[PDB]
């Protein structure tokens, strides 16, 4: 009944990250 944020630190990192570096990974 605790550790709400502590647990939900930075799990969602994917969201907001296109990268778009597959065509020119060079």
- Residue identified by tokens 């009944």 is 1
Buried b (16+ CB within 10 A) or exposed e, 5-21: eeeeeeeeeeeeeeeee
Structural determination approach:
NMR
Backbone angles phi, psi at 7, to 5 degrees: -75, -40
- Residue identified by tokens 């709400």 is 4
Token pair of 15 as six digits = 């969201």
Contacts for 6-15: CB closer than 8 Å, 24+ residues apart: none
DSSP 15: S
Extended strands (E) in 1-26: none
């Amino acid at each position: 009944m605790v550790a709400a944020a502590m647990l939900l630190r930075s799990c969602p990192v994917l969201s907001q990250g296109p990268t778009g570096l597959l065509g020119k990974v060079a």
